[PDB]
Write a protein that binds this ligand. Structure first.
Ligand SMILES: [K+]
Ligand SMILES: [K+]
Ligand SMILES: [K+]
Ligand SMILES: [K+]
Ligand SMILES: [K+]
Ligand SMILES: [K+]
Ligand SMILES: [K+]
Ligand SMILES: [Mg+2]
Ligand SMILES: [Mg+2]
Ligand SMILES: [Mg+2]
Ligand SMILES: [Mg+2]
Ligand SMILES: [Mg+2]
Ligand SMILES: [Mg+2]
Ligand SMILES: [Mg+2]
Ligand SMILES: [Mg+2]
Ligand SMILES: [Mg+2]
Ligand SMILES: [Mg+2]
Ligand SMILES: [Mg+2]
Ligand SMILES: [Mg+2]
Ligand SMILES: [Mg+2]
Ligand SMILES: [Mg+2]
Ligand SMILES: [Mg+2]
Ligand SMILES: [Mg+2]
Ligand SMILES: [Mg+2]
Ligand SMILES: [Mg+2]
Ligand SMILES: [Mg+2]
Ligand SMILES: [Mg+2]
Ligand SMILES: [Mg+2]
Ligand SMILES: [Mg+2]
Ligand SMILES: [Mg+2]
Ligand SMILES: [Mg+2]
Ligand SMILES: [Zn+2]
Lengths: 98, 140, 141, 83, 129
RNA sequence: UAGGAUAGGGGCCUACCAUGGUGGUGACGGGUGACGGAGAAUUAGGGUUCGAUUCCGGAGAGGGAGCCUGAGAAACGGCUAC
RNA sequence: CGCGGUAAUUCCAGCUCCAAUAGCGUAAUUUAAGUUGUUGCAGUUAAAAAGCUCGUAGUUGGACCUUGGGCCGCGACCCCGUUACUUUGAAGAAAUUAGAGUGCUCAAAGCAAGCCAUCGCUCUGGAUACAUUAGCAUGGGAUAACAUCAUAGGAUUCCGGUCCUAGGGAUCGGAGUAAUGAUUAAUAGGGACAGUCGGGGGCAUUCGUAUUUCAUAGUCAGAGGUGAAAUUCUUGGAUUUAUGAAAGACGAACAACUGCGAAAGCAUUUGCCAAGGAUGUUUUCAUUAAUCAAGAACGAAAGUUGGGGGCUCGAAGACGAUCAGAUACCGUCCUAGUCUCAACCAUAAACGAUGCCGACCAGGGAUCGGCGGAUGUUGCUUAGGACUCCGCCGGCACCUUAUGAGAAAUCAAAGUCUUUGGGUUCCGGGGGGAGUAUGGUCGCAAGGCUGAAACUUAAAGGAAUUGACGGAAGUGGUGGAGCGAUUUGUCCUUUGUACACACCG
């Protein structure tokens, strides 16, 4: 039984795709197959935000952010609940979270 | 697809010739290994009762099948022949002529009896059916 | 389909239905013929002669005007090439690739393309020998 | 549209112009020859619309057309008429 | 490549008839396809057809009347004597009452009944019913 | 090519000469519990398998070999030898 | 397939019943078998598409050329290239087969016989068909194969020459003649040209941070690593911080249901070299083509031989843990290796588990490359670029739908299949034994290619359903769907399963 039409990856009209290394376990996963998330967080937890914005010499100072594109293998993405097992009908939905 | 050309008769014939060897029946017939069988292509064979033996049935069944160990006369090959018809082992004695036949599945083992494809049909010139039905008696 | 690739292009020219010259064509037949003769005299091949007669002269198609093809006209006046033009160009490509490989040994891709080019050369040479447009013992090395 | 709504022998001429040159009832070229009129000098010098050659005015003047992927680009300041 | 233009013609006609189309375009055209189409028209299985001259291999536009169940070619064009026509019709025709096998004979391209009427054998082009 | 031999053609054999001849369209070799065919069994059609045996053809008379007689035999209910 | 463990429809018997019947049981071959498939099977997942491409033989190959017409009357009329194929004829022993006749009493047979009775007769009968292939002959030329196929240099009159021979013949020339003699250009193919496009390839070149090492400088008790630890480093400055240099790899983010390449594969700059697809074309040749045994080219990673390099990581190894054990998973240090050159190796779940070429047959919106048209705004340098819109061709794909197919999953091809035939290559025939033995061949080796049998076994296997389980996540009716088990209704659920005695499996 073939579970997915794309075989669990994104590879059409090409042969080899270079792999990445999983952020958690350092597993070798193809770049097109690995689960990829772009996390834009703040260097300061929502809580420390006020305390830090207070201890600032410069009154006008937007707190810098953190940008990171995180790579995950299937096992770690499922374990971390980044992706969850879905019903047969819902698997064909590729739309990002509504 | 398969070749279809009017001029491709040789291709088709050669392909069929090569593929017929995949069929088990064809290869059994045309390999020549049936001449190395104990019977060497004959329906029946005679032999000497070497010793009376009892071999256990398969796992689901629990019985002692009580076959016979027979040395054929035409080639000196030793085989195990089943003795049907309850009580007919007592008609079988060592150094006694027996006519063996196939067990009905063409060299394949039959029923719950493992490794036996031969049955005793006639002993000392008298059929086992006659001795079972008391139609004749075994000569002394 | 491309003979030596999976490309399936269908780009090509489409000759008009009308096989007679358009009324605006006024060049006399002998004029276009001697123009072709000069064109071949410097060394142009019939494809280039047709291209020039098309884009630099009022001649859309030679066959419509004269009634004959460029190679036939050149053969009539004894200016046809010895090696046919397509084979000439294929051999030129082959010798260019061979020179490149004499400089570049690791170029395995160019070696594969050279094998393809020489296969095309052998095909076309076989056809030309069968049609007797090449010497019966003509050989490519 | 639905071919049951058309006649394959008498196709609508509006939609035949947009078909590939070879996919028409009778294939015809979409190229043409033109009488290019230069700025001041007469030099009609008929040009192929899809010319692959840089057409030069007879009096060795500036170039008149430029080869492209498709139709040739007439030089700046030149008119033309189909033939 | 195009190996049998007759096969492409008949298969396109069959697909168009199954689709319910009332017109089918055939390309390339050939004398054998026009001769097969004439037999088809004579037996009433198609309507008008039009050869379109394009100074190349032509085009045929055939009117369809919904009376076709199937038309196909036999490849290869097996040699069929007059005596083997019965076996061929049993192989290919739905019944002994309807259907036609098209033969190429030295007397012309014709259906199997007409081939029997002149006692001429040949090669099988195809069938329609 | 020229002979010899044979009832007669022929490397059938001899002398000389040339380097040919066959082969994946399978030569050569091996297997056959292979004499060939007419035929036989089973077969919707197509086919599969068999064909020692009374008709036709071939071959052998324990195995080889060699002959005499005779129109006709390399005979075996003829001979000679191993 | 199963039965027999105390109620045996199955054993041993009796009774009764059943089938065939003067017969019936038991132990190679045909049928069944469309399970050998030419008719007529398969190869996404059940067995099975070669890793990929080229390529000889073989097999297969676009269209085009004397048609109409009427008359008479189904025949005819009029306006010194082959072969296949087909038609007809002659042959193809008899017996056998099919079949005509015939009351051996019937029949299997046989080739006899029959007749009012007959010194005899019916000339009594003792037919006919079939008979591949190959051979011979007749008619036909649609289809197809092979051979040709613009020095046709064609032919025909007149005028000649030479030779032979009772004027004739043969041979070689001059001059006259005719519609002087060439199918078109395939939404086949090759080649040319044009502007492009690409992470296609080779060579050289540039850059990038990281990492390791080293040098300098600051600081002082931990650093490292894990679930927790420990192995290990560290007051002779570990770890951390800054600067600089060297080395070797590696080319993030951009980066995609995107591109290029025959596949493998290919991602820093620039330059050079050769190559390529698509598009455009009123350029050229003119069938040159498709697929391919033989034979070649390339072919991830690991591996082999030697040189260089050796940062990182890291088989083997050592040690530390965990553990009932732990030759593992976790941690530390690491050898070969990972990088490069030369020479080999030729294997991958080398996968789309789907060979290639060609035709047809739904709809739709994206996207990439090229081209055409229409646009109205550009930190733009009129064109053109950038956006926008509409088309055409080509490419990677995607969505919906069944009118299709399928065992279904699913597939717009895996469709156009018992209404079965477009071309071609490879390749499968229940499960194991077995990709094993042996032989051969290639390779230094590792191994690769080719490749059994004996024997064993009643299933193995595929898809889907329900349930159960998970050290996974969070009850009818009628109607509708499904070939169906089932399902909807009923909105513990979803999910995986090789379990169904149901994980105590
Ligand atoms: K993914
Ligand atoms: K092109
Ligand atoms: K002789
Ligand atoms: K001789
Ligand atoms: K005599
Ligand atoms: K597109
Ligand atoms: K219901
Ligand atoms: Mg791969
Ligand atoms: Mg002689
Ligand atoms: Mg024998
Ligand atoms: Mg016989
Ligand atoms: Mg014998
Ligand atoms: Mg006898
Ligand atoms: Mg005899
Ligand atoms: Mg004799
Ligand atoms: Mg004897
Ligand atoms: Mg003798
Ligand atoms: Mg005797
Ligand atoms: Mg005798
Ligand atoms: Mg009983
Ligand atoms: Mg099957
Ligand atoms: Mg499997
Ligand atoms: Mg499989
Ligand atoms: Mg043809
Ligand atoms: Mg393999
Ligand atoms: Mg495979
Ligand atoms: Mg493949
Ligand atoms: Mg079929
Ligand atoms: Mg098997
Ligand atoms: Mg219901
Ligand atoms: Mg699964
Ligand atoms: Zn992971």
């Amino acid at each position: 039984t073939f579970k997915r039409r794309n075989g669990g990856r994104n590879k059409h009209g090409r042969g080899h795709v270079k792999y990445i290394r999983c952020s958690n376990c350092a597993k070798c996963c193809p770049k097109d197959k690995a689960i990829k998330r772009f996390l834009v967080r703040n260097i300061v937890e929502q809580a420390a935000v006020r305390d830090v914005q207070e201890a600032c010499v410069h009154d006008g100072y937007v707190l810098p952010k953190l940008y990171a594109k995180v790579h995950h293998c299937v096992s770690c993405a499922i374990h971390a609940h980044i992706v969850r097992v879905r019903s047969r009908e819902n698997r064909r939905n590729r739309e990002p979270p509504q | 697809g398969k070749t279809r050309g009017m001029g491709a008769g040789r291709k088709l014939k050669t392909h069929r010739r090569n593929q017929r060897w995949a069929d088990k029946a064809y290869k059994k017939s045309h390999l020549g290994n049936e001449w190395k069988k104990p019977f060497a292509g004959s329906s029946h064979a005679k032999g000497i009762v070497l010793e009376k033996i009892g071999i256990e049935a398969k796992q689901p069944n629990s019985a002692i099948r009580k076959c016979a160990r027979v040395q054929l006369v035409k080639n000196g090959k030793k085989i195990a022949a089943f003795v049907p018809n309850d009580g007919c082992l007592n008609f079988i004695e060592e150094n006694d002529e027996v006519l063996i036949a196939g067990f009905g599945r063409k060299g394949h083992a039959v029923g719950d009896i493992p490794g036996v494809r031969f049955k005793v049909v006639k002993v000392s010139g008298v059929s086992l059916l006659a001795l079972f039905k008391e139609k004749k008696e075994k000569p002394r | 389909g491309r003979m030596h690739s999976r490309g399936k292009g269908i780009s090509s020219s489409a000759l008009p239905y009308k096989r007679t010259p358009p009324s605006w064509v006024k060049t006399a037949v002998a004029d276009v013929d001697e123009l072709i003769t000069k064109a071949a005299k410097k060394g142009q091949m019939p494809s280039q002669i047709g291209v020039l007669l098309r884009d630099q002269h009022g001649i859309p198609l030679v066959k419509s005007v004269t009634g004959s093809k460029i190679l036939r006209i050149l053969k009539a006046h004894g200016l046809a090439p010895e090696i046919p033009e397509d084979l000439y160009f294929l051999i030129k490509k082959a010798v260019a690739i061979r020179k490149h490989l004499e400089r570049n040994r690791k170029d395995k891709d160019s070696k594969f393309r050279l094998i393809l080019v020489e296969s095309r050369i052998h095909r076309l040479a076989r056809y030309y020998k069968r049609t007797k447009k090449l010497p019966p013992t003509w050989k490519y090395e | 549209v639905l071919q049951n709504d058309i006649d394959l022998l008498n196709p609508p001429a509006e939609l035949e112009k947009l078909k590939h040159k070879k996919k028409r009832l009778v294939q015809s070229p979409n190229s043409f020859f033109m009488d290019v009129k230069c700025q001041g000098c007469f030099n009609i010098t008929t040009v192929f619309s899809h010319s692959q050659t840089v057409v030069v005015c007879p009096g060795c003047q500036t170039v008149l057309c430029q080869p492209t992927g498709g139709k040739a680009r007439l030089t700046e300041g030149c008119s033309f008429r189909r033939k | 490549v195009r190996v049998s233009v007759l096969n492409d013609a008949l298969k396109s006609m069959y697909n168009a008839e199954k689709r319910g189309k009332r017109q089918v375009m055939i390309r390339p055209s050939s004398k054998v396809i026009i001769k097969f189409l004439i037999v088809m028209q004579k037996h009433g299985y198609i309507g008008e057809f039009e050869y379109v001259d394009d100074h190349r291999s032509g085009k045929i536009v055939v009117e369809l009347n919904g009376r076709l169940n199937k038309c196909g070619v036999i490849s290869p064009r097996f040699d069929v004597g007059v005596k083997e026509i019965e076996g061929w019709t049993a192989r290919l025709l739905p019944s002994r009452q309807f259907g036609y096998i098209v033969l190429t004979t030295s007397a012309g391209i014709m259906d199997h009944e007409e081939a029997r009427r002149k006692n001429v054998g040949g090669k099988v082009l195809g069938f329609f019913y």
